[model samples]
Target chain A: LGGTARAERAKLVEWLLEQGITPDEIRATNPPLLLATRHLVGDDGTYVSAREISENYGVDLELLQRVQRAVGLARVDDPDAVVHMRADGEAAARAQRFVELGLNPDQVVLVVRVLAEGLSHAAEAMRYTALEAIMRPGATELDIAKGSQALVSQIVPLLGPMIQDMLFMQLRHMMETEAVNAGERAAGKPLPGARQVTVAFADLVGFTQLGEVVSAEELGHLAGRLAGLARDLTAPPVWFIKTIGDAVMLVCPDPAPLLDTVLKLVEVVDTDNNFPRLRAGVASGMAVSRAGDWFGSPVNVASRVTGVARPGAVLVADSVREALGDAPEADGFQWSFAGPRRLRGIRGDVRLFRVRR
Target chain B: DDLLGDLGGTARAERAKLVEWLLEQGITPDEIRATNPPLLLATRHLVGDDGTYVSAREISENYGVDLELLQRVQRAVGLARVDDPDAVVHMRADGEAAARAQRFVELGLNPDQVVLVVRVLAEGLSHAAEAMRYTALEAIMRPGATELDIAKGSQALVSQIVPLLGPMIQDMLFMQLRHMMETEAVNAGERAAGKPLPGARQVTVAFADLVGFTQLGEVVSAEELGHLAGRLAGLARDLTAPPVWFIKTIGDAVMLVCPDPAPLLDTVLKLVEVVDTDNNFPRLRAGVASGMAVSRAGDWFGSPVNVASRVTGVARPGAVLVADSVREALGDADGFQWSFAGPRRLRGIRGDVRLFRVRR
Candidate 1:
């Protein structure tokens, strides 16, 4: 009707049928649900158990179970129950795929945990919205199914390619930042692993108290505005890793962008007088990365410094300034004497600085 | 053991005060006594008696962000259940979780898009965040340990590890969000393919397997397994040049994509020779199949990719196998050698492909 043509719609149906769906079955079950889920499930083959999947794929069976649990799926009660689909067969096989990557079984769980957690939540949100869209008063199961089928055909296609494209984009960025080095090249040897990285923690001022008047829409904006601002500051060396309710963390492979980005973010919020002020603790030291995240003392000090930071200030552990040798004056900022203080639980009195531009 | 029976008098008295502190922070006395004091001590690094803890209603009312939305976000992150509107269930880091859900709003994602992505983000990452917690908790729950031993160990680990996971989870969540913001076409005659075209792309999707990897894994130290895997990654990265994309090294296998068949064939030929000479490395076998396929981010996706993979397993150790398509594409072009391996039926590859062995 929108110039795509009903004839064209029929052609789409033929492909769906060609993919092996019976016409009545499309109307029997929720077609939209089936189609939405097709990315994970390839050409529908024979049903089998997760055990068969694990056995044939050579992945550990209980590893398969943990993967299922991690993805937020309910247990597959009977190992032989034809309940496990071919997609799961393929899914378990991916774990087997990583087995040779020198990952132990637990390490394999760590990777799957991240992968499953992301997709399962998306699926629930996906299905939840679909159920609402397809439900009707006194509608037949078949009636709702057919309606879902009709609605999804046009809408789902436009969305499909975008999903694939986005994943490709995310991965491309991930790979580019990955540096390479020598390794134990002969098959079946174990590997080495990030301690030098700049870390920053920036948050809205008095955010916990700000929550008293928070609304669903309003609840997100403080953090919302920060994410947008932080996101724009990142291109490569500087990265906006994540945001908490009122706090945001930034990491960079080196020091310069970390400082510039953190400062620029503070300046952005400063202009929005109606919005709350921002404070950041910039610290640099040895930070280790595990599964696409950073850790260690620099991470801790960055937050610790943020707590003692005055509102609307960009605070720094002396490490921040120390690493930025000849950088502060050149980076076009001046520091005030704001330190000689002991951070609780952290040993010793440390030098901290407040900055102005 | 009861709390006082195991601990020193003054140490026990301080812990009792710790119990008193928990009640003030909305941890009921029943919860303190009823729960493992160690567990409470452990988690206190998070939701303990900190200043300015807020109820769900405060933010729900003020921000117009419903308590329901935050609850859903929490559930998305792998928490078990819901919360009362007024419970001080949230300390602060939920702001990170909630901020994650909210950033979508700024990105202009729909309600469904926001919720779905956050759920997806949480589904994988929720476990990652918990990884540090459970890893710490389990490690200290060693045999013959006292409750305080576990508690003290946990408190320090959780404190250190929480900060570690924060940047990690955020970095992770950031990548996931970017996936949403970032296509169509090919037809009845051929609009079924994606756009941004040139002449049809002829891609060589090559699959190379370390021949004796699993067998070797059994005999070798795990350190050796890691070093070996790392070695494969290193060698692939070093040898691969532009136009020939060394896609990824998954454990024992490396997937390579190249547009020009000659360069790809040459790259892998040398790839084979290099690994062959490595005395400590497993033998290598590779399959090369070339045809028109969709390419994205230097990775090829199509039948050829799978075909090459299937042919790889069919080939003998240290040998290179080529699909009929690959053989045809390389016709009379190079000085490298080829011998007919015979018509081969590859699993899920339909009928038979006239496969051949290549020698340099």
Candidate 2:
């Protein structure tokens, strides 16, 4: 190396060192920290330290750390961390605006978590899909690298708008739900504990034995088909809650549809010779719902009832029969009383009924 | 008129009332009858086969459900409550649904449980629908396309795509359910055998972090930060597959899980190489550990995840580090060389943990 070039390189290294770039880092062909910063904001070279970002944007360093942590970033314990770029300064500026808009620290942190987690999933899904498309059989590493870059460039622009539109749709649903809840509250018809609905539990009669006999992949396909059938049969008022092992739980506002749906499900499973015989227990009651699953006595009772049900039989609790009123007979639906039976976890023997056309 | 031709007298009256309400809401008849088809088709489906329009009173009378309870069910599903007890808006399907819901009341489901069940169903269905819509639009829309263009294209494709989405979502759900069950079974077996069950497998968890991510936050706009974060997330996702899943991203770091150590190490090296070649991307470093870790609710935890995270924190720029366990697992497998970095105390761990720098 020429003396002049060596001197200039030495001087640049000295400046980088002053910026907190370690000696080992400067010795490397590409310093990791510098490369990361340049990757995020390009090499226009006008970078600001974290302290400077805080001072320029009037954002509290503690709040910045909280934001960083909320978004799943590492804590910046080092005051001299030369991490902030012009973009960071701008971000700090926006954080200040959020505070000005009256979002408390807790709310700000929550907002950050939501944005980070949601977008993180979306980003991962897109990336995986793109890569799956590009890295086909016989594709070389170089081909994959180039393909990834091109695909990202093409797709990145659409992400923002697509996410925004979807968010709006979700927000609309949320607002509508709230509005309806408010109206119910105003009408003095507040739900005692929560919303009231009937929960039905249906299980494949010989699912456990079938599982022991079938391959895992085959079981997965069967489960998938079962779920598909449940979803297809569920129209508006009848919601397919979730499937647990061999059982599918459904919910509806009325017991008649619940019974009707259960009967149809039994028919569907029975008609399909490959599928195991189906039995269901319909119960009308209070249950706790969360994360797409229901809990409490209704779910428990329904499950227990399903357990006691004969193969290809649809059993109903007395409560469900009572709600059915004259509809069972009036609609030409005959019910044979199965007498009170001891259901596990229930206080006493609960009367059950068998439905027939 | 053609749309309403098959309706009986009462249904015809109900349809007229709905039309009047639509007009009151400022929707033109032309807009209602547009080529999109979904709007009309959806309305017809809501009306159901019997064409029996139900009111809150009729539902309560026929199904023995309380009017208030009925309103709560309606609200729980994100539908507006009709103030008029005699408002002829609900269809026979809705009446049937109300009847089914009344059964819950009979079964002793507390109001809270019923509301919650409905909310969960509504929330799940809404999110699933939104995801499908977004995925379809993303698949069809070109670069530089506006939201309007995407919407138009989505509308055109809705009928064809909607039918397929139900099965596709079900398939994914089933696959996830199976995966969760398998992981649980492994954990349960380990627990029964009196083994450390935090992570139930000899899985490798790696954290690849951008060297100065927090600092980059200071330099970019929130939108730009999102794009960069998304890009990093995409990279992680692309590299993930069976035996290797992109668990989650923490800030500028992508956390990955793999059943085997060798593939994870290879992926990390390739990730760093790719990022290095992209002038617009930041330099990267990674830490990998092979051990048992507990998987819970879509997140990985315990020793391996924590150790890998901390190791990444201390790793040198552009270098990958592995815990002693990972090195031991490699066991003379020949594609790479490793140098022990001696024992160093990590922040959360007790005593000095052995670390190795990996080179290919």
Candidate 3:
């Protein structure tokens, strides 16, 4: 229980850091939660029924009102016990009120669902702000917005995949370790399904040169637009990890969606006239999972493949070709094998392939 | 009957006056006493209570006025004082009810006294939470502080009161400053920009440099340099005006430009002073320029900016330098002064700029 509490406290600190709460401000207040409450309630702790919370935090009515306003509450005077009492209070009240006001239950449910999704987005946005503040202090609003775009590009598409990846990695590592320990004790074999996964990299050319002319604000706006286009073109059911400036790193459940997404990206950038020249490379059979980031042979090969590609081109690693086998090809795009080329961070010469459209 | 007529006349006049007073004080009538007590009492008395003067207890029981609320109203109206020596006099004269009336009469006791009392009490209670005694304030304050102190202190305290007072206060102050700085001071800006403002004597002027800026320009891409430069300028600007006005920056170097040497020196000492743990990145070097400088061309062209810059150029990163004059000014004021590197030749400057480092 103590360990769990400590972990929870650590997470709270992490969240606070992410929120851009200055260490000085935290230090000045001391006992973070109490400080936060005091900041919220001011000197008057009489706003809510939590008298104990008020006293501990040294919060007054005025502070409570300010905090209440910050949190979108109607009144600071409203009993705080309500927040805990009805953990589902707002959601539940919204449902009941909607029904009473003659809305259909299904529609009400959809509304709730939409609100929940919005809340999730809001949370990510807040977290992104926090990260940007820590990484770039004394950052202008423009800088913050730009950095937030990077966060949005990183988090929006891959949030679900990242969570799943973390859970799977934890489960698999635990299983394999347990099996190995058992085998050593009882003289049994180790667990299976611990092989490498595929990884891919896509980069936009001339982005740095482009940034030199435009202001950071404009660059941020452009990035935000381009990121959205990337998401739209890539479609769903595949994960795009993040964009480091103009480049994007992604993971695919299978090679087909990965290749298809790459093709779509190329088509969108090339044909749409809105996006800049984009280069893409795909590689399969990389050890991934344990780290949140992708690594190993396939990753290296994928980067090398992209490096080889001329402007407005795509390259595929040998592992990717193995994954694809003999799939039907789309029109205007043809696949051809390139002879073995020396790639960095790899032991042997890597065979690369191209899909030119 | 005559007494009743006089009471009614007094009540009518008092009600009008009380309403005007409350309005003048910006206290809403609804928030205070919704109905004037004199009128309520007069109307009740005109239809007689069928008894002698009704006590406060009877008024509470019969008219639905809570005893505590009535007491609060009485205290507010200057009728029955709580924790006051004279309150017992009123209680003896006519008990609670007549005393409440007589208390009104004493304050030029109008029939509308109840409303006025309620208005004051309600407003006081509403503002009670906002009244906080600053424990550390005494250490930084003077007795019988001037209007300027009050004004500046209130302005400084706004950041503290901001959470309690809500955003309205902020919006008001923001609008006011914006109006003053922009619309009202266009000519002031022109005057400030056209010529160098008068330089303050015995002032500690700080100069900061972006270390390895040239090297950074060479290594990092042009785009990165622009971003980094913009960030550096903004950070420098923020620190300049912290306690007061932080003068202006000339490209890579920023100056303190204050009247008092003490605060300015303290500010310079705090220039390389970083308060955050998360961003323990590259710091800047600072130099202090004191003594008189010629004012012209919207820049302080004297030994201060020059000597400070030279001193800054010589010192390693995160170090501050001061001239002998700057050191003397600080020392005279009993500020901690230390001599580190003495007499240093700076690039593009004649001879050597005398440097005395401030001991933190």
Candidate 4:
């Protein structure tokens, strides 16, 4: 029990920290009983138990619980189920449509079974869920279109590191050789230990402007909802470290997934009801990783690009454009080049491009 | 002789003043005799020898005072018996069901007696409750307690109270320690940064260990061993003063430091004595040393801290050992005899060190 208790305590502390308990606060209060109760139950139980304690202390239990969870628990899921309910319903409906359209029952059944199984196994793989569910016997053509529309809308806008990685794997062999040549021209330094990859920073536009009109209570709620959506849209291949204000900083070891994640994020924000319109910046070059943070020219460029973007825009450095070579055309973006412009603190002019979406 | 006679002089003086005030109210021995039956003597004396007793008709006609009221007041003040001044008098009234049917004559009072009867009845209740209230006072009274005693009396409650609620107390202590340590740490940091900081000093540090704990662990199962160790740790942390910091616990040993050394020492000694006399479980030994221990990172650390822990290992069960330096620092004012242990090698130290066992 003691050993189990210590492990559970560590998890509780981690949860609290994630929820924003400062190191100073942890040091000040003995959380042994809180930890014990949480361990006896769970993180959800911790909130309930704390609410009960607060109630005993003459606080409104429901209000206190909501505030506590908002400040202290990180939401891992951010889905616009209300907006996408039609999408999900459509997907299910399309399965029936495929059957109604006189498609082979056996093939349709296989697709339906696979879709349901995939959703069950890894519901996070939205594309897989979209594919088989729309093809099932229970869905209609309009439902399939709606399902496909929802998937594309959410999955395409994020131009993050995962998209960058997917792009990078395709370009690695050709790029690695070019990288070696480029390294030789620079300092004859062997392409270094690890390849420096492009970094992309994307953030929702008008958050501060929105914040001005919103109350702190409302802001906290919005933050939870928005952050949850950001997590879901950016998961896998691309890792979302944390959100800074309204912006999310994501990294990719390669440029492809980073690009893909950012583009998808942009798309999701534009179409999903739960998210606000966001701008993204993609820059490809070498970045140095240290102390769990990524730095160097590419990181600065990515940030600069993101800063320059208009609301619902995706901006990229010239190198990112050079790297993006004709994969899938990004929808809802009108591509245009922004001429070489000098960014503050950078020694040279950086050629930038804008994608008005 | 004057001083000896003056004891309770204020009380006697106040009583005499009250008697003087009573005489001015026209109540005298002569007036009391007019209606002077055994019960009505005082009123009769006050009214003068009108001889208004024997017949209620004659008394009422002569004095024009309600004869019933005069009699009731006399009976209430214990003039009825005359021999026993403290004896109480009871007046009869109609039963609740018969009260409506009863006339004023049958009720044993005239119109003028009504006010006098009400006043006497109110005064009687005040006297009765006050007399009966002594049991409440005695229950709270300790043996030989004075009127000015200030502390709560719990002799009646002692049997019902647990000597120590071991685990609950430990958790409370941990909370207190955390608060103190955090406050101190922040204050120290502020001071280092040239900000105002509260000054704290001269704290006692104690280290305690379960003697032969390893051997005991060898005999018990791992689960039981853990349970026993946790209980011991909890007790050490909880039963000490609120400001006492449980610096750390390793296996069966615990280290604590307190702001005031005397209370810390007292707590340590008492805990050791309790464990010993109660035969509750495996006995423990402790070492207490006082000096300027620094509080940091929710813990205590100093040279005295090192010495105190070394002293703990050398202590016998139910004993508190102290370093010679600690004793010298404290001086001899506390009525403790220091028995010298010339020199001995202690763990984690290169040189032999002098130690002392405190005998009280």
Candidate 5:
């Protein structure tokens, strides 16, 4: 335009050439946020390739690749285009540790797979929740960018503690169960080798119908509250398994405690006028535990029995009743026979009973 | 990373100007541009770039207000005291809120009232902020992301999605305030020819909570407890009409207030009936007290408020206990019957107040 000041503009525009952005286009962005964003996630435009981490960690490329992938990382697959964070090196180091410890890499991958899926699920939930706060009223593009950068600066560090709490607590529970088995390997096996555990299905009454009346946010909120309630009810003997949409699946080696939890759940939900009613069915049998869910005839049959129960009722299969025997009666339980009923997917008829306290 | 040596002459000067602006705005570490790791710049966006902070004393002295009052205002607004009154404990926004508190004090609102209104806004906004945090975590937890990936993507989201949701909160809050003004004007003031100095208004206050709610929490998940609490919310939302004003729900306790005692009496009874007979549910006990009460920022203060809560505390399960004032307001309703439950000394009340148990 003018003098060397204009010549000065000419020189700076040349510097802009490396960015491939014209002065006017560069001016168009939230310049403050653009400045913050580059290093906000990484060092001064750093691009550490994914493949670099394995070489630095002295781990094999394949298992290291498998490590991040098993953690539910939806990656670009090729290392050429994808930039890895330092945690990628950390992940490789973890893989190296497993190999050094003489653990089966495949089994370890399976463990990582389960935990990663959960953290991935939880993080996605945390994302939307964080967004509403970041995006405030009359927020500028720059404002939101700052909010996002601020969040990651915090949440990235926040991830480790609670995730470890859940992992360590679960490992403790598993270790206790496995220790008994390690000693029982000192014994023998009978037939199919399925473990004897009591399982129950407690579902919210009219959960499906309630969805028709409420919005998605409220429904999800309700389920969260339900999950919180179920986990609180369990003792060391009782296991709070997983939530299956409207219901919670429970497992326990002891049948009595499982039945007690089911009845208490129904009773607690009953006195609350606003809460929907509860119905549950308890059964005992050999079941398989994988992916934190029980898969067996008992889980299936217990679920079916819960469906058959009336509102605010706890019903049980014949085996669960016979397992409890008179001990439940001594515990102030009144069991009434509900006659044999034909259940879908079960042979002949299964005798069910109504349990009351 | 070594682009500095290759920069054109003017570009170097321009970069210095940007760096100087950061230091002027209180971005930590004046040498950050040199050390400039990825997140330090992101940290700038996280916190405000307002210039050096001022001690709480400096602001109080400017307004000629007492430091104690300002500290009280700070606590009520959710910031606990930081030991040193001379510490740079507040920001530009916080100072502005302090200034506004002075404006209210000059406008003749009681200082306590100002603190309470500040506290109420603090709680409401704080609750909203808490609720919004979870939504952000899920939104930002994208596929195959690292810290920087999240940081950059979040910045993009700030540019895109943040603005859209902002107006939802702004408009929602605005409409709610707008409706409150509309109701409080000619309608509320006109009904009894409202008086300015007489802060007292006749209202029947009712309190009800599930009998075993605490024990329930001990045995049940806070999740399920909250689910039941939410269910209680929906129930209260539908039950209260224009005459019966539904207050907030804490845990599983529902607080309701109404100027006209008749509808509120019927409301609590109906609520109790529904909860009492639910065999699976624990019993819900209700206690109602009617008298002239002072309303401050939606929280009713006076004898009736305390009396009603105390009444609920001692009442039997599945029963609707009533104060004499409430019982007299209903007199003899067509189907409703009342039995004198003897004079009982309620906690925090002056004497033994006669109580009645209402039945249908």
Candidate 6:
């Protein structure tokens, strides 16, 4: 044990001992797992202190800590902590470059959060699958570690191309859709009308009672069935926004199809014995969409209308009724006015109509 | 011919020609009949009228892959396994699925490994697809549109936007996968170095829940309860960012993890303030603890998690409670006063753990 290799191994073991790891534990660990770790963070065997990285890269130490935290990583309590490896230094440099390119601190933090969220979810999913696929209760720690190391090595390399391809396709679609939207707006077509859209809310009547009477799992299943119905009933011209607990929010550029889809959804729910009576409220007006959620008065009003809707009925606001006009009867649908009703958090009495077959 | 009997002779002749082309491609009549209507319609739009549907066996033979491997790939991607090897599955025009399976094999992934990778990919891709469908429908549909209008819009969307989805989804997957790999590597490196990883860090885990959420649900309609829950979730999302990650919402409660005890305390206080100020939203009580814990598969575990949950359960209405470790971690920190509630045995913990009431 006198050669360079032996010396290197001895030094490694010494470092492990200093870190409170036992010799037996080191022997029990899979060598490949350690090697994979080295491969990932680089083999320089030198850890740059966080303070040094901060000073060298002209980045604030506090900002670095914030960035680390944003990425769902732990913070180094000591400013001089040797937590920044070579790989970490490279990452810091990339972040510094982004700042140089005029990305504000908040935006940088947002990017870090998004990356963390996406990657964390991906890692969790992959890890769960691997554990389920390979790991057993009786397996040795070394074997489990080695299995994970092998999996990371095999799957990690393929990810680069996959992510790049997905981003490119997403960007292309965004551009195409934006271009089409612009062209339509320029042509003075009845576009999103200043981001105006029909927002609707559909919920199961007596869903609270249903939850009380049914098991939690059964309640979840019922909610899932309703969500499935929303998905199936939704086609082009009617978008299923999201299912929030017992209710589903939908948005459409036009009123007619939205109404038709709502009716279809009600019909589908009515046919299902597992489902309770369904009620929907449709409101047409301006809506602001952000972070995959819709907002503004129309959304609020639609929600309010849904709250007041009778079981198994499709309710519409004045805007939706106006949008439908005389076409309701011509289209084999009838609207019975429910008269002006005062709604919570809304100014003035609002007129409502019930759509009937 | 009977399937196309309703059409005029020209349309009928076109159908016959397409049928002949499909048969030539090794797609049997029974297989054609077995194809689901929605899938058939999609294939007709994607691959044209002459595009044929082929079975897993045919695809395996055509691509020089194993039939069993193809079936495994299908099951891995959350598709139902076809016991009938000759049952029509993939469309002739699109070879992406078969190509992906071939690549997995070429990469030397064993069957189990392939399944794991495919399952992860399928989960992410399907989630993205659901989001895309939601957004696309929102963007395309308009007020006063008819069923025919929707059909045309949907068809156009599929013909145009769907083409762009594949590359977009693939790129997103790669981006997310690469980031995950780097994170995992860092985590592994830290663990190998005998350093405490973030998952095993002495961080604070906090649980904040509406005091009367269940009782409120009993009185209000489900729709109202949903709105209230959504609002609470929204508040949690808004408050927990960076240094504090929102673990998840368990019905009426939201669990959050923070790098330090102070942030967790701040978040809980803020949440209480918001809930208290809002007349509609119910009061919230919270509990926090700082200790080592294991974070795996998007969940947290260990003594800290259990202790924090128990603390939350025992917290007084609109009050915030902290385990002894949290108070110790916040030693000499300003802006808050803490009163010790002498060591008491928690339900799960072996010994009596001192609790503290936090006050501004």
**What is the alpha-carbon interface RMSD for each candidate?**
19.8, 18.9, 32.8, 45.5, 22.6, 12.2
lDDT of 4 at B30: 50
What's the CA error at residue B62 for candidate 6, in Å?
A: 10
What is candidate 1's lDDT per residue for A242-264, written digit by digit as tens?
Answer: 55445677888677678788888
lDDT-better candidate, 2 vs 6: 6
Q: Which residue ranges in model 6 land beyond 4 Å of their true spot?
A: A1-47, A55-66, A76-79, A84-89, A136-143, A190-227, A231-319, A330-357, B1-285, B290-302, B305-360
Best by TM-score: 6
DockQ of candidate 2 relative to the true structure:
0.02
Give the per-residue lDDT of model 4 (tens digit) for A309-329. Answer: 665667788877666555745
Candidate 3's residue-wise lDDT over A1-357, tens digit each? 268546755655655666556677544422343222222112211222433344544544343332222222222134444321111121133233333333344333323332222222223223323353324656432343344334333423332332222222222222222223322222122112224455666765533322112222223334445555666765445666544334566676577777778877766777654455677878887343322234344555676677556546678887876776666353344778763487543567777777764
**Cα-based lDDT for every prediction:** 0.54, 0.55, 0.42, 0.43, 0.54, 0.58
Question: lDDT by residue for model 4 over B26-48, one digit each (tens)?
Answer: 44545322211112222222212
| Candidate 2 lDDT tens digits, A1-357 | 368635655555555566455676543322121221222112233555556667877778777655544454333445456643344333433444445443355444444544543333333333334445565898643344345444434443333333333233333333222222322322333322445668887766423312212222233345446656777887768778766434677887777777788888888888877775677888876543432344455666786787667667888888787766765553556789873489744777798998865
How would the candidate models be sorted by lDDT, starting from the highest?
6, 2, 5, 1, 4, 3
Q: What root-mean-square deviation over C-alphas does model 2 reach?
A: 21.6
- By TM-score: ranked, best first: 6, 2, 1, 5, 3, 4
Q: Summarize candidate 5's per-residue lDDT along A196-315 as a digit string, tens digits.
A: 888888866432312112222333345545666786776677877755444677788878878888888888777765566777888887665432345556776787787677667888
Candidate 1 lDDT, tens digit per residue, B1-360? Answer: 243324455446555655555555566554554333323333443432221335557766655665666665544333323246676544333423353354344333356445444434432333343333333435555775543454455555445533332233333232222211110111111222223233347788897777533223212222233346546756876888878877665435678887767788788888888988987776778898987665432234556776887788677767898987876777554877889899988754675888889887
lDDT by residue for model 6 (B1-360), tens: 543323344434544554555566566676544421112222234313333456777777777887777666554443322457776744432223533555646655556555544444443333343334345445445785432344345555556543543443333334344434444444444445544444467778998877543333322433243336546766887887678877765445678887688877888899988888887876688888887765543446555777887788677768888998887787554698888866767654666778888977
TM-score of chain B of each: 0.51, 0.45, 0.38, 0.39, 0.52, 0.53
Question: Fnat for model 1?
Answer: 0.08
Error of 3 at A127 (Å): 20
DockQ computed for model 1 against the true two-chain complex using alpha carbons: 0.04
- Whichever of 3 and 6 has more TM-score, that candidate is 6
Worst lDDT 10-window in candidate 3 chain A: A82-91
